[PDB]
Design an enzyme around this catalytic site. Structure first.
Site, short mmCIF file in Angstrom:
data_model
loop_
_atom_site.label_atom_id
_atom_site.label_comp_id
_atom_site.label_asym_id
_atom_site.label_seq_id
_atom_site.Cartn_x
_atom_site.Cartn_y
_atom_site.Cartn_z
N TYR D 130 11.59 39.52 9.60
CA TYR D 130 12.41 40.39 8.77
C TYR D 130 12.76 41.69 9.48
CZ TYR D 130 14.25 41.66 4.18
OH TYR D 130 15.08 41.97 3.12
N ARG D 161 7.94 30.50 -1.27
CA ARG D 161 9.18 30.00 -0.70
C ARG D 161 9.61 30.86 0.48
NH1 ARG D 161 13.75 28.10 -4.99
NH2 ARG D 161 14.78 27.88 -2.96
#
Lengths: 231, 231, 231, 231, 231
Positions: D130, D161
């Site tokens: 990220y 997820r």
């Protein structure tokens, strides 16, 4: 101040002459001014896309002027008369044209029945659904249209995946809508199953008429609502 | 400097006169100045959308002035009194209106019960959920609203895929939220299954009231939090 | 040139006086200058958000000056002392607060243990995960924070689809992070299954502590790396 | 005109002196000019990020000049010698570092074997995937790099997820690539299944070497192609 | 006014000389002017990317001029003769080159058969599909091309997930299309199943010819339609 108007519109260009005079082309006539501050004002207006209105008794090319109206007049693109007389642009893909034509005919017929001819619809053709967002953006930036409708039939052919193109088209139409501040109605439909059989053809051939009628009602309502909230 | 204020607001336009004087329209009164540097200052303020405050004893159209306050006054759009007295814009789609109306009524009733009438709610109608982001963006740029709520019921009809439109609407609402710096609450809900049976109708008809109450509480809390962190 | 500094900061506003003098508010003191070119320079600096430093012996409101430092001083927002003494903003949603609080407490405790109190954490509350990107953008634009952490628990309730909101929130946090050049750590987690049973509650209640510790380590590492590559 | 060059580079700042002279800092030397139009020219160049070249016989701080070259010289950031001697930035996440290190080593070894040492690789560490797009954007704006490579191993842990983060990272890398006009190679890979067993570890440990070799070849080819089409 | 043209094109740079004269490089010749207002006009035109036309009898470097045409002439990039003689840029990935080459050959042959040689196709090579959007953006911004075609074969290799890259590529191509106002045709195809068997290879090897012919027809139609609606 008080002087009959000659030209009104966006400044096409601002020219400097040999005699230290500022020549500015507004509308269909070219005019020049001798005010040094007016040169900077017109240059900034052209840079920022701010329209000016030049009123003078010499309404001809090369004429002189000294009074300029900087009040809002359109700032470039813009069109529209009254509130119930406008134009709509219809963009249709040419894949499965026999189904899209049903929606187009239904849309045009319903608009004619409702407005009685006050609303005009213009039809534009594109090869596929992927070509719709750019065409819509190009048409929207010219003014001249209160709404834009895009019609396409995106199906799964059983060989290649089709969701990428549909997602891109929907997202691009939304992006153009937010960019240009012009409503864009979506008649880009993706059925769950379409196997090009005889049974499948008739069902969607019949359903696209209902889709077109719904699109016509939605377009009329959204244009009226935007006009209302625009005070 | 020290002079009673006459007009305060964004510059509508900046006009050049025949006598090399700069006429600027601020508020409901038009005033002109004879300072050459003030011409460039007002032109730059109008270009950059910076508000100015003109104070003079001649508070009338065409009056003269020489002192301009360039301190922050709103820079155009802006509204709001105190901290607990604001306005909220409610945008509702007209598909499955009987279910969305439950959420709208619950929202209004809860806001009235909590704030006691200090918060005002305005209702706007759109044809479908696809029309919500543009309406929200248009309403946000006018100021006048501390928050915006969008309510819609996006379901799978069993004929066409529906996830593209829902994804586009949610993404567009987030984009408008980030663009305009105005909170946008989402009451756009997509159920797992809705087969338009009698059992399905009653369940969601009942659940949308709870959804509206939750939305009202969230809107109040987020407005208060933004007011607090704005120092 | 060589003159003791009086005020340093972004130009709040640029004022024109009656005596053709340019009054500029820098810091907590208002000062005026009589240089015509300095008027245009200060106007352009305010337009482009370029900070200026005014050094003069008359450090009071309304004082005069002639020498201006245009060197970089922050250009508006900016904060931070040394390299290991900074601040972090923690944004937590209030849905399933008993689970998010575990991550928050773990994060704060780990930061206190590692930095020994040099790093300060500030906690902000939002109604739901959908409100996080706008709050992060608002907090980031004020400076004052070397990193931002967003914590939320987005689950599938079994009635409405939840992937749209999670996708929008993740994309919005990424967009804000790229826009403001301020790192944003994500503790917005979506479990595969959560049926609100007793067994499910304890597992995630325990796991969020580990998640918070990991987030604290990641934040420290990323801040140090950005400081290092900033030369 | 015809005068030996002294300093060439982007304008750091433009300063106004007490004697109505414009002091501009170009390169490592500060110089001042006495041309009033040059003040506006330098201010506009600094505002628009346009580099200028100042040539004078007094190559020292505070020296005077009258001739300025406004021809293109880099406009700020920029680096690169010849066409086969450039630099590449390698950004690697620290999750599953033992697998990513294989790709990094393979990439470096292949580049050394092919270019013979003309291409330099710099390694930057980030906590997770990220954090890659913002680091890549920060590194791209400094020039100094003909390409950027991001390596990460994003897997499904069986609890939360993972597709949201992968989608966000890929989209952000593409957005940075389009924003900064600097190629970004993607070695962010998401396997279909990874259960942290012994069999799974060895397979990907071996495959990342091939991935690194492919990435090295792709980077060389794309840099050469961009250099060729840049005429 | 009336004077034979010497140079027409975008302003490369605006130079200030020692004699308070404004030297501007237009086209392949450098010219200087002695009008102070022309200095600001040329600076603003260069800043805003507005082309100017300088007509003078001294068509040589360093010559003097006083009359400048500010009418539209291209504003920088731009190319194209007549309406049926243009150029198309073909970008092909090098993964599974034996299949993409079929589409390329079909496209070129169909264009040659239809236009009779009036349309020219240029071929550019990229390592993978991820490199297509940036190459398309770079090629589009130079003018010189009425359309851009991107061809790639993105398949699922059975080890890593492939939908992220395909989604990013399609979205980036749409974004470049909307940014540069240049049509981009998509021949980036993702099959449902491709197991590199002998049967799979022949089928797609044959189908890419049909895909190329369709792409050629679509490109011709969209270019003609844009030319028509451009009035």
């Amino acid at each position: 101040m008080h002087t009959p108007d000659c030209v009104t519109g966006k400044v096409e260009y601002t020219k400097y002459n040999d005699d230290d005079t500022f020549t500015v082309k507004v509308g269909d006539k070219e005019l020049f001014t001798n005010r040094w501050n007016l040169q900077s004002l017109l240059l900034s207006a052209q840079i920022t896309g701010m329209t000016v209105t030049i009123k003078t008794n010499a309404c001809h090319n090369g004429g002189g002027f000294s009074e300029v109206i900087f009040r809002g007049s359109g700032s470039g693109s813009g069109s529209g008369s009254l509130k119930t007389s406008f134009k709509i642009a219809f963009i249709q893909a040419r894949w499965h044209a026999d189904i899209v034509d049903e929606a187009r005919k239904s849309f045009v017929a319903e608009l004619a029945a409702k407005t009685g001819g006050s609303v005009e619809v213009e039809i534009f053709d594109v090869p596929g659904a992927y070509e719709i967002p750019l065409h819509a953006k190009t048409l929207a930036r010219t003014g001249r249209y209160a709404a834009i409708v895009g019609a396409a039939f995106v199906i799964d052919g059983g060989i290649y995946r089709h969701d990428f193109v549909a997602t891109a088209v929907i997202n691009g139409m939304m992006q153009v809508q937010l960019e240009t501040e012009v409503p864009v109605l979506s008649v880009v439909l993706t059925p769950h199953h379409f196997h090009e059989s005889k049974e499948h053809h008739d069902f969607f051939h019949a359903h696209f008429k209902v889709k077109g009628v719904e699109a016509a009602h939605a377009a009329l309502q959204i244009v009226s609502e935007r006009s209302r909230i625009a005070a």
